Design a protein around this ligand. Structure first.
Ligand code: HEM
Length: 453
């Protein structure tokens, strides 16, 4: 297993020497965020690695990133990582490819406009009541609060409510079938010999597909797919039903499932990261509460234009996503041979935009390890959209981005209206990141939560 391991050597592209069969995969064990940053430091603008035999080209030049993510998205860099064994979930928008992706993305676009988001605002804001009640019971407990329990439950509640209109109280119904099924999405493929064998030996994917082996939790997929069909007999779901070029009843089920998959852990982790930064920066937290109280005096309920016009809240969310871009990197496959900034790259190679590394780059951000929301003041020069990519850029960016920001802002408004967050002896400071999957802390974020009354 070395046939491709001379590619970058031959092209002159720097990078860490791969091992036979494994490639550079052993360097993932410290975390992809750490590997990308150390490679950037060591090799510069562009470096090559191998996932088994698969060549991987990382690029950090904003102009080359623009060509990959926008200019040649339809012609060359249309799809992400080559598809693992996923069964009918291949129809999910995030896993679909080429013409099928273009159609599905186009059918779902009316669902994610800013106009539809303004309509669904009351359906989203209503989950703030449960959130505050849950956190109150934990705050009035006089003990540190494990944030991920509170905000994981909120993240699940909102994405499921906006999906199906079912108001589950995740935190208070641990044995609800929706709750237990969805939690299987956490730690997606952690140390699983199946995921690793797929990465090293991508030719095994059609074998596992033929055996009904899926990277997803089968029992979760089946429950959610069957749950979708029974409700159609009797919302994101309602928008897709009305749109029925057709969106088949299996394609529609794939979207319902993938929205929950994409929005659940991401929103939860970012929320918890945000409150860590506010607990460790009281002055930021107090400035934000000052702005919230000036817009919504006497804990007034949030409205749409009030959320959109909170500048410092927007800066705080953006600075949190700079420090903690939970997807770590963007990935595209060369569906044919392509020249990328003078480099001839073979068909099937992967191109990586190392979001985390570029977000912590001292060449673009002064004091890059510091939490400074003022970076995102609209008075300052615009932020290069190819350096700052927590949601990606171009035709294949995060379709739920607007919704995810709105959800997180509504959560942060309601808890900060009622509570203050400070560290305790059990708080890990500095926070250390995990080494697997989406960005999350090595130890669960715990904080002291005090009510403002
Ligand atoms: C803070 C929370 C979230 C973060 C950080 C996030 C981040 C991302 C990122 C980085 C991508 C990859 C885009 C690219 O490759 O350029 C992505 C894709 C996607 N996200 Fe999100 N996302 C979040 C919440 C959501 C939510 C709530 C939804 C669903 C409503 C969602 C649905 C998707 C979908 C469907 C894609 C695939 C897009 C496609 O291939 O057409 N995300 N997200």
């Amino acid at each position: 297993g070395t046939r491709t391991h001379g590619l970058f050597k031959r092209l002159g592209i720097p990078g860490p020497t791969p091992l036979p069969l494994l490639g550079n995969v052993l360097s993932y064990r410290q975390g992809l965020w750490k590997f990308d940053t150390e490679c950037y430091k060591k090799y510069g603008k562009m470096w090559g690695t191998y996932e088994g035999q698969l060549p991987v080209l990382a690029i950090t030049d904003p102009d080359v990133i623009r060509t990959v993510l926008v200019k040649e998205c339809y012609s060359v860099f249309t799809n992400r990582r080559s598809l693992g064994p996923v069964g009918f979930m291949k129809s999910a928008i995030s896993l679909a490819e080429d013409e099928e992706w273009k159609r599905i993305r186009s059918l779902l676009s009316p669902t994610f406009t800013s106009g539809k988001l303004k309509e669904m605002f009351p359906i989203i804001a209503q989950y703030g009541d449960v959130l505050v009640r849950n956190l109150r019971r934990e705050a009035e407990k006089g003990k540190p609060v494990t944030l991920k329990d509170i905000f994981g439950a909120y993240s699940m509640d909102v994405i499921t409510g906006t999906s199906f209109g079912v108001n589950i109280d995740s935190l208070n119904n641990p044995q609800d079938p929706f709750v237990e099924s969805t939690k299987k999405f956490l730690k997606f493929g952690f140390l699983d010999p199946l995921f690793l064998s797929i990465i090293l030996f991508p030719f095994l994917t059609p074998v596992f597909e033929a055996l009904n082996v899926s990277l997803f939790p089968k029992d979760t997929i089946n429950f959610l797919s069957k749950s979708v069909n029974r409700m159609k007999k009797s919302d994101f779901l309602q928008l897709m039903i009305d749109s029925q070029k057709a969106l088949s009843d299996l394609e529609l089920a794939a979207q319902s499932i993938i929205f929950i998959f994409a929005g659940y852990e991401t929103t939860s982790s970012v929320l918890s990261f945000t409150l860590y930064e506010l607990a460790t920066h009281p002055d930021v937290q107090q400035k934000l509460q000052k702005e919230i109280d000036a817009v919504l005096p006497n804990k007034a309920p949030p409205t749409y234009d009030a959320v959109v016009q909170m500048e410092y809240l927007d800066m705080v969310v953006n600075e949190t996503l700079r420090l903690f871009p939970v997807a770590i990197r963007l990935e595209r496959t060369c569906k044919k041979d392509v020249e990328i900034n003078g480099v001839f790259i073979p068909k099937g190679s992967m191109v990586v935009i190392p979001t985390y590394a570029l977000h912590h780059d001292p060449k673009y951000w002064t004091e890059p390890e510091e939490f400074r929301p003022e970076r995102f003041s609209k008075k300052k020069d615009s932020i290069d959209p190819y350096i700052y990519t927590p949601f990606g850029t171009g035709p294949r960016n995060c379709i739920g981005m607007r919704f995810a920001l709105m959800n997180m802002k509504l959560a942060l408004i309601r808890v900060l209206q009622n509570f203050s967050f400070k560290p305790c002896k059990e708080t890990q400071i500095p926070l250390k990141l995990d080494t697997q999957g989406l960005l999350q802390p090595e130890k669960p974020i715990v904080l002291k939560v005090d009510s403002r009354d």
